[PDB]
Design an enzyme around this catalytic site. Structure first.
Site, PDB file in Angstrom:
ATOM      1  N   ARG D 135       1.138  -1.371   0.274  1.00  0.00           N
ATOM      2  CA  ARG D 135       0.238  -0.085  -0.174  1.00  0.00           C
ATOM      3  C   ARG D 135       0.835   1.295   0.502  1.00  0.00           C
ATOM      4  O   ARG D 135       2.255   1.614   0.229  1.00  0.00           O
ATOM      5  CB  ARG D 135      -0.997  -0.063   1.312  1.00  0.00           C
ATOM      6  N   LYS D 160      -2.553  -1.800   7.517  1.00  0.00           N
ATOM      7  CA  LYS D 160      -3.617  -2.023   7.717  1.00  0.00           C
ATOM      8  C   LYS D 160      -4.208  -2.651   9.013  1.00  0.00           C
ATOM      9  O   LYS D 160      -4.119  -3.459   9.314  1.00  0.00           O
ATOM     10  CB  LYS D 160      -4.220  -2.197   6.771  1.00  0.00           C
ATOM     11  N   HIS D 267      -3.804   2.193  -5.828  1.00  0.00           N
ATOM     12  CA  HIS D 267      -3.453   1.217  -5.371  1.00  0.00           C
ATOM     13  C   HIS D 267      -4.375   0.800  -6.651  1.00  0.00           C
ATOM     14  O   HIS D 267      -4.412  -0.442  -6.625  1.00  0.00           O
ATOM     15  CB  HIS D 267      -5.149   1.395  -4.321  1.00  0.00           C
ATOM     16  N   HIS D 293      -5.783  -9.929   4.080  1.00  0.00           N
ATOM     17  CA  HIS D 293      -7.037  -9.999   3.866  1.00  0.00           C
ATOM     18  C   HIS D 293      -6.687 -10.817   5.032  1.00  0.00           C
ATOM     19  O   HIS D 293      -6.283 -12.001   4.754  1.00  0.00           O
ATOM     20  CB  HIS D 293      -7.639 -10.372   2.338  1.00  0.00           C
ATOM     21  N   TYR D 302     -11.279  -9.882  -5.438  1.00  0.00           N
ATOM     22  CA  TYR D 302     -10.225  -9.557  -6.250  1.00  0.00           C
ATOM     23  C   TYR D 302     -10.038  -9.846  -7.369  1.00  0.00           C
ATOM     24  O   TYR D 302      -8.671 -10.469  -7.768  1.00  0.00           O
ATOM     25  CB  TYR D 302      -9.088  -9.192  -5.107  1.00  0.00           C
TER      26      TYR D 302
END
Lengths: 313, 320, 320, 317
Positions: D135, D160, D267, D293, D302
């Site tokens: 990211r 994140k 992104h 994830h 995705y």
DNA sequence: CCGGTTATAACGCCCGCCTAAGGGGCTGACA
DNA sequence: TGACAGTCCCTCTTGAGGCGTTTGTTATAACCGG
DNA sequence: CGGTTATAACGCCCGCCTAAGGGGCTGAC
DNA sequence: GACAGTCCCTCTTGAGGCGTTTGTTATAACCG
């Protein structure tokens, strides 16, 4: 009165607690109030509880596990029934009897055990070890549950309403087919009966598939030699083999061969798990065969050769 | 012959566009609920009575936790929507109902054996259940537009939001499909003009999206019924797909005559589609895609009988 | 000097046999708590003050969620045990402190390079950290009896209940180990007679199990301190193991001189033990056994840098 | 003091350790909520006033459906956690209409051409965004010790949602990386001898636990800025990392200076990483782990013509 | 030797407390 | 005079980690009068 | 262009609908 | 008499999904 115990039984049945769980809890709730002069548990609490439990330990020589069930049964009563939970500090005399290590036979031991066993019980016990089945799992098997297309057995609704697919030993195919053929005979005979309500089905299944009870595939794999008269809905059906008979069958045969380790049905299941592991099977593989939801449980079924990295430096 | 109350509920639901099978379901538990308290009005009863009914189903009734759960779902609706006085019960559940059935598949031979007995005009949709793993109602609700001969696939539209999925299609079925789309237009032509015909049923969101869609053959069902019927949510005549119960009965008896001993239903054909794809080496994610599984764990069940059985785990009895 | 209150708490804990590191920890947050409210008595304060302190740490203090959580653990004890007036705060947590650090391992070359600089009488315990993956304190608390030359292994006793684990042992370390057990008896002999010596420290359950155990060499530490010390939970002289901080400083500076750029600590050696076992083909369950992991997921982290890095996943940039 | 109520809300959240960005997001919507109404206290308001602000955002606001969602949650937070009086779950309001455009995903050649017209000053960073699906801020916050040459990998600390992960690295970048590290070493060797250099900035209270860490090279940023900054808290100067915004436009411009009419941003380079790994045959869970994830179901969002190549089982009968 | 209440074993899998670390310094009596 | 060890210290953190389980539910094993 | 808004994207349990599988009746051909 | 049926049912679920603006936490896009 006996109306309170019945209301407790109703509460639990609605919340769909297992049947055995209901009996277990009731029994301890029962001999709890029985302990005290049958005084209503609503007028009791921590105090009276930490006495019954201590009464079980001392002057009761109750097993630590036995005491635990009681503790939970009581806690259930006071939390779910009379919405007034006990305290988590209730101190009482804890049992002392330490559970003996899980007994596990050996290749040759099992090999010799399966010998002095009459053909009448050779298949069933072979499934207990060959597919690690639990006693009642094996006894409740049904004709459609055996899969010959793939070496497997469908265990429907095992402990805790969980389904699973276990492995089968190909060598039993001929024996199995014979056993099925044997069951087919009783079926062909029982079909023509004045009062044959077919095979017993799981919760209100006969209402959804009214014909199922008369279909061979739904009939038990190991039926009894005679017929029984089902109390609910006065009708006769061919119940399955008797558990108790198998249980002692394995106990006696265990003696009639040596083996002074006190071996029972679940010890044959332990062997199944142990043996798979000793051959190199992965723990999660064994886990799936037994039906454990988490490996950590199976690891409590595994109770060198690693060269130190320093040596390779 | 039923109560004026039940009839009012059925209409309440048909207006909110609830599914047909939902209406049948909810109604069934509502009338059973009512007739349990001797036609007493449900507006005069509450939690106490609902729990007494649930307990009734559970204990002498011996119903399954999931069916008792649906009953509670019905009554909850009956009180939350109709009769603006929601319940306040505590679903102190215990047993978990995420436990799927153990799939039972047919051997490629048993399937050939089955298709031999399934009479014509019954096997195109049946061959689609196995050939494309479709679910019974995805098959019955197929639309002409959904069959793709260019890429040899079928488009399945599940749920609203425009959600779909593209499954594989056996090409040795093209001529059969062409005959069907034809037979479909044969009805579409003789119906397009009757000033009864309101066109084919269509999801509210779509019908308003393409107001003309209900009248274009493109959107018509691939397997239309023998005759026009009345749409209960709009009171107009339209042609519905063939009654699904037809295939359910068909498959069942055909297997019976075919001499197959294991139970065979539409689901069974779908299970076989999945298992056979895996046996040939397809990747679970692929098969997961082919079915509509949003979670591989679901698809994985078809894996068990394979590598969780003899071919994957050698029984300890097979050694010593 | 410190307060009479802090001293009373330290003693309250030493009586319940709380761990040494626990006492240091809890005390630290208690005094910091106190000195934050201008040395006011904690019995005159409650939730309001505790929350103000926690908020203080969190906000200008910029402490980590886990350290603030330990602070709350301390104060909770201070109020639940001492001062029989429990708190009633709501740990409305938000970060999830299950997130372990990303292991950093040393190359077999960097380890050789390290051991070259680690001076004698410092490398036996250090070679045990890497050679047997021991955790710093499992190494420091080793007992003569624990080293097994027959099967070439070490027994590690973690937690009470008689829980243990058997790790691998590098055989090229036997002579070094023998010298240590000797040096150990060299102290055991000169100490067995001093009528100060109360014997080696031993877990309450054990000490009462084998009342003589504290006096038999078998139970003595493999790496004894240079001198006798006073046991705070019994006020008697005994010989403690070497101060762990010694190795921590040793490893750190030795790596610095060895020219290794990445941070090196005792944990690091343990990480390297795990990773290197895997690289040679050991099974995770095995390595899981070697460490004390009760859950493979824990052990699996050592797997990532291997097959989750270049050797296992080819970067898309490495193609086009 | 209304500005005081907002400050108490900020304190509440900081104690419960909510993410920083979450606090700003919630505050901002709480702020322009009370701002909407004459600055009147939210304690004296409820469902009614809420289902107006939200509708005000949709209509005469053309707010994105997602934007409205954040607002809805911020408000709900305020009324549940702060003023312990939760809103109702029936609050009806005008839902936005603007439908989010499909996730843009470049192609091999597109990316191939994108990495071309990019000055060396930003070639490495953007190559990591695609090569290791990082990211934006993950790449910018990297530190010297975070690059693992012994194994082709990169340690992404605290990505994140405070989650750590190990991602793959493209071996071909080793020389570039080492050069970049060497470049950072120079600034370090120079900055070490400064009248007021508090070393590199460390995560929450780390400098207190490892007072020396801030002066260790390994903890220094991989991509430092050309100059130095003056940290407000604890008046000291340190070498902050490269500027995000600069990289963000760098990738935007280079995207135009190629062709590419799809509006490509940072992104979208990450999306390509996931997409490309999948197109080569990598397992979804493999991609899941590289992205961080926690559940595959997220990664499946995705994986959205061609030939399924799945031969119907009927055809094999 | 048998069925039927018992007594126990076995499955169940999260997180609240407690306990390890890793650092910089700081004293002593010691080669 | 200094490098080192301390049941060192610390109003220093936790990019730190793990043990423990008798307050849950559901089986099979075992006990013990006719 | 930087300080503020706008809004993608990660998160991932289960309430409430909807789909089955079964006998059996029946009304238009 | 077969037979399909917006069939019927006071059948049931060894039945199974979809759906997701009332949660958090990033990056991208605005404008003075």
């Amino acid at each position: 009165g006996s109306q309170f115990l019945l209301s407790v039984r109703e509460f639990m049945q609605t919340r769909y607690y297992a049947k055995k769980t209901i009996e277990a809890y009731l029994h301890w709730i029962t001999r709890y109030i029985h302990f005290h002069n049958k005084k209503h548990p609503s007028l009791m609490g921590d105090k009276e509880v930490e006495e019954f439990l201590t009464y079980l330990a001392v002057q009761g020589k109750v097993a630590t596990k036995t005491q635990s069930l009681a503790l939970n049964s009581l806690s259930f009563l006071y939390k779910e029934i009379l919405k007034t939970p006990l305290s988590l500090e209730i101190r009482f005399q804890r049992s002392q009897l330490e559970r003996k290590l899980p007994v596990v036979l050996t290749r040759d031991e099992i090999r010799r055990l399966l010998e002095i066993v009459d053909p009448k019980h050779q298949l069933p016990i072979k499934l207990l070890y060959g597919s690690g089945l639990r006693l009642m799992e094996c006894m409740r098997l049904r004709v459609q549950d055996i899969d010959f297309d793939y070496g497997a057995i469908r265990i429907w609704q095992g402990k805790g309403g969980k389904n699973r697919t276990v492995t089968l030993a190909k060598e039993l195919y001929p024996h199995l087919k014979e056993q099925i053929a044997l069951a087919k005979r009783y079926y062909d005979r029982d079909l023509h009966q004045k009062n044959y309500g077919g095979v017993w089905l799981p919760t209100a299944l006969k209402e959804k598939y009214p014909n199922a009870p008369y279909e061979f595939r739904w009939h038990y794999l190991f039926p009894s030699f005679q017929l029984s008269l089902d109390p609910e809905s006065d009708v006769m059906r061919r119940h399955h083999m008797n558990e108790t008979v198998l249980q002692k069958a394995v106990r006696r045969s265990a003696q009639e061969a040596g083996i002074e380790k006190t071996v029972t049905c679940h010890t044959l299941r332990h062997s199944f798990a142990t043996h798979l592991l000793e051959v190199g099977a992965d723990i999660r593989t064994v886990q799936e065969q037994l039906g454990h939801t988490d490996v950590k449980t199976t690891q409590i079924y595994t109770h060198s050769g690693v060269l130190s990295p320093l040596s390779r430096l």
